[PDB]
Amino acid sequence: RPRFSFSIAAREGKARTGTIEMKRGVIRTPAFMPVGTAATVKALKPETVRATGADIILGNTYHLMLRPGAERIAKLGGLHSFMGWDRPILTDSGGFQVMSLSSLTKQSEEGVTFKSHLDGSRHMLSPERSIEIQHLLGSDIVMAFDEVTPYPATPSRAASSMERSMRWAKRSRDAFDSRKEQAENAALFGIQQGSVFENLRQQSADALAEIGFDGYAVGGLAGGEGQDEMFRVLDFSVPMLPDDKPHYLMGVGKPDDIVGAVERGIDMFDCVLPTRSGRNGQAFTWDGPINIRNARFSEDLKPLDSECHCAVCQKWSRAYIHHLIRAGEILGAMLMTEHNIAFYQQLMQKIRDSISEGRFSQFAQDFRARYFA
Amino acid sequence: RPRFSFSIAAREGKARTGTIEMKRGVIRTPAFMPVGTAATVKALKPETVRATGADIILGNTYHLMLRPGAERIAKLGGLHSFMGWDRPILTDSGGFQVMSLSSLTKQSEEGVTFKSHLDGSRHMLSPERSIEIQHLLGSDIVMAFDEVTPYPATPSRAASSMERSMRWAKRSRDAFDSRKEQAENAALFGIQQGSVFENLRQQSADALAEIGFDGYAVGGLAGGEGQDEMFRVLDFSVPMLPDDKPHYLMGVGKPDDIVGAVERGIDMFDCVLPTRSGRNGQAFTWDGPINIRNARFSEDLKPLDSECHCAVCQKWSRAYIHHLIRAGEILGAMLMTEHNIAFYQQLMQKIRDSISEGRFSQFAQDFRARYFA
Ligand SMILES: [Zn+2]
Ligand SMILES: [Zn+2]
């Protein structure tokens, strides 16, 4: 396999289905990436993550650099070896979480210094250091280090952040390219910014395409704007990106969001929703989500979802899982997470098959009628 | 397979190895039973419990009756169906936990009434109700309902409790026998009491043998007396029990305790140690236990134990598991528990093979030299 090759096998409207071939494996697109926070997809062995259909997982740079440490993971042989997942890993740049989880940020053109939300330790993150950490982890898909624009943002501030992000995207590119081993074996994605503003999204897309990346993420969304606005922004933003490279919508999302975003040209997704909500009691079904803690499930012998092919739905009842989650049992988190992640993979499979067969628009319509019945 | 058949295949001194055949499967003895509290062996799917080598698990009656409820489990098809373990299950009588976990106990000759440590609900437990609950769960090995003698106990109080326990053992026997379906498909074990006193242990054994049970537990030990005293009591107590039936030491225990107790004629064991300590950071090894949270393991690439055949030791390093447990990750509990339970099953296998080969005494000596090196 090559370092990176994205091939589009079928299209329907703006939707695409295909494959990304990398050294560690093939990624089927549109793709959902389960999120591994501190080097684990929560409550799942990697073999179980793979069994659900995942082709690639996401690792959080910010969390890994704080614990167990980027250098330490490198010494121990890299993230893949450390956690036991041998397929591709995408790492985020660590920037988003600095804003959302650290204390005392000091921000500047060089990068950001911050205090750990764990200990009192002070850490630094810049385009160069972010790229270095991702190398130390041995990431397959490296994200450029950007400055995240909170929602809502004024046009002036959105512009300033976007412009800084574009300067940092060049720095990221150069850092990545300067490290022979990373340049030869990993891929680099740039992140489009500009908040909800069309002209800024355009300037950002143009800047990113001028530098040149293996893939392009749409950043700054799912920040509180709501689905209507998100979709409106995707409408004009995705077409600005090079059509022949993957389009990654960071941090999205709910099943309905994924469907609409694929309709708009998105090829890759990640979210903590299926894992996080899993441990919380929310199970996804084709008829909409359920909260398994609800008393109405205490004696329901049906599986979580009536069609789901996952091992949880083959083996255990809603009643049992209701019991486990109410009791705060670890097996409850294990089973809910496996089911939710498998649901997401089944959704992605249905999306890929429908596009390949030229009936994705019908699938979207059928999916919505039932999910929101 | 028959309802119950215990066969002894080999002996060495007081040690025995053999099999208990029951309708739901064969139990190899000496046996270790992982403990399922609220209908789950904590952090493990039943298939994983089986994969470690477990032939039978233990379920806690007290916890099951409070949540999700004995009647409810019956309605849903019984404990096996509910939790997805189709092999034998031994249920305790629920008495021990009433003493240790409930509030406001009212005790009498009829039984005990108590308040849930969960809600404010008031529950009752008597020989008859304990046997009924175990039937509703669909237990394969039913324990007689006894009164537990705290350590230390005066001879007078030990005697009074033992005598009451023997009256309750007859009541348990009669209750079990009166329910055709339970009598025909399950087995009933009596519990010897009498604290540390030889004459009381003798009276108790004589009373139990007169009633007649499928197996005999040594109760009242591991209550704070220490290994020396426990062993001293086992020395005279086990021989009092019918030699041709299984001998069950309830609530034991550490690996060294298991070895010494088998040397003294014990065939069955349960303890929360490998599960509980697992989540706590303690991993069993042939060279003694380790606490994986210790900083010395942060970059140790070796498996938890150098000889262990479990899936955890095949796949992950001490360094990774150290990280998971420090981080409070669910996968940390999953991996530690699987390893610890598999260690216990490997110990039991080595014990069975050594007895079968007439070299158990040497195995005990070799085990101790290394474990306590
Ligand atoms: Zn499922
Ligand atoms: Zn092991």
Author numbering:
A (entry chain A), B (entry chain A): 11 to 383
Task: Please give me the paper's original passages concerning this structure.
The reaction follows a ping-pong mechanism including a covalent Tgt⋅tRNA intermediate. Hence, in an attempt to generate a model system for the active site of human Tgt and to gain insights into the relevance of particular amino acids for substrate base selectivity, we adapted the Z. mobilis Tgt active site by site-directed mutagenesis in order to mimic that of the human enzyme.
Within this cavity the dihydroxy-cyclopentenyl apparently has no specific interaction with the protein. As a consequence, it seems to be highly flexible which is reflected by the ill-defined electron density assigned to this moiety in both structures. The crystal structures of Tgt(Val233Gly) and Tgt(Cys158Val/Val233Gly) with queuine reveal that the Val233Gly exchange allows the dihydroxy-cyclopentenyl substituent to occupy the created cavity between position 233 and 158. The adopted binding mode of queuine will not interfere sterically with the sugar-phosphate backbone of bound tRNA. Solely in the case of Tgt(Cys158Val/Val233Gly), the variant that should best approach the eucaryotic enzyme, the result of the trapping experiment indicates that the covalent enzyme·tRNA complex may, though to a low extent, be able to bind queuine.
